[PDB]
Design a protein around this ligand. Structure first.
Ligand SMILES: OC[C@H]1O[C@@H](O)[C@H](O)[C@@H](O)[C@@H]1O
Ligand SMILES: OC[C@H]1O[C@@H](O)[C@H](O)[C@@H](O)[C@@H]1O
Ligand SMILES: [Ca+2]
Ligand SMILES: [Ca+2]
Ligand SMILES: [Cl-]
Ligand code: NA
Ligand code: NA
Length: 258
């Protein structure tokens, strides 16, 4: 046939072709989250959009290194240094530092999350941008682990609306990765998600991440159609565009036929 038939039952992921000035990296918005609140972030509605009802603390733009690896301080005999959680022991010390005098359960202030001065012990953040596939095919996004709660969404009308990156979050709970902290205290079951993507189209991408106490961890990767994996640093893959709600042709509902 002269043309491709298109993905079955209109199943292709919606993408965009914003015509404005492209900027490298993703925008990160920070929102209030209560220390030791282990319930709020277990709700899908909260993780999809409810987070933005809380106080907005600030933002940073142009971020290409997007994994989270926040370690709390150990106030030790030789000074105060961050402690890798796997090196924490007893009640409590940090291997190579001796006993720590400080509490694991209070808020700590730091610029570790994207250079923004906040409380990485207790915070919710929203990463937005567009993912640009260099190759046509199946992409598998992954979280290596989640502490405390997280989602990843890809696609127009799922992550956000085309050419409307800066708008209040949309209500879709159709997550690409559901890493929401289970109520049952369990581990989130599936922390990978696959999307078929067409080279050169801009795919809206949203990551919402929350921490309630102490350590925070979110190692983000993507496996490309060629089988290679990009981890942590998504430079060359992720971009931002200022809103242009007047660009009529910005949405591509079916890139499999466009
Ligand atoms: O914590 C999120 C990001 O913050 C940035 O300031 C760091 O340079 C990155 O290594 C990290 O992925
Ligand atoms: O409530 C779960 C908590 O368990 C602790 O072992 C982790 O270190 C915290 O970072 C986590 O938030
Ligand atoms: Ca829509
Ligand atoms: Ca934590
Ligand atoms: Cl030690
Ligand atoms: Na860590
Ligand atoms: Na520290």
């Amino acid at each position: 046939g002269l043309v491709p038939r298109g993905s079955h039952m209109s199943g292709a992921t919606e993408a965009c072709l914003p015509a404005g000035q492209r900027k490298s990296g993703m925008n990160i918005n920070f929102y209030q989250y209560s220390l030791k609140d282990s319930s709020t972030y277990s709700n899908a509605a909260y993780m999809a959009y409810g987070y933005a009802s809380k106080t907005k603390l600030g933002s940073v733009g142009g971020q290409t290194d997007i994994s989270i690896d926040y370690n709390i301080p150990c106030v030790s005999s030789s000074g105060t240094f961050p402690c890798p959680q796997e090196d924490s022991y007893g009640n409590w010390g940090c291997k190579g530092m001796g006993a720590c005098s400080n509490s694991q359960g209070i808020a700590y202030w730091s610029t570790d999350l994207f250079g923004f001065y906040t409380t990485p012990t207790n915070v919710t953040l929203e990463m937005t941008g567009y993912f640009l596939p260099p190759q046509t095919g199946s992409y598998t996004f992954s979280f290596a682990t989640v502490d405390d709660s997280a989602i990843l969404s890809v696609g127009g009308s799922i992550a956000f609306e085309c050419c409307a990156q800066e708008q209040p979050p949309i209500t879709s709970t159709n997550f690409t990765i559901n890493g929401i902290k289970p109520w049952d205290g369990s581990l989130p079951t599936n922390i990978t998600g696959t999307v078929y993507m067409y080279a050169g189209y801009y795919y809206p991408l949203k990551v919402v991440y929350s921490n309630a106490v102490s350590w925070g961890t979110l190692p983000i990767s993507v496996e490309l159609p060629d089988g290679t994996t990009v981890s942590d640093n998504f430079e060359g893959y992720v971009y931002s565009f200022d809103d242009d709600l007047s660009q009529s042709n910005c949405t591509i509902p079916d890139p499999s036929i466009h």
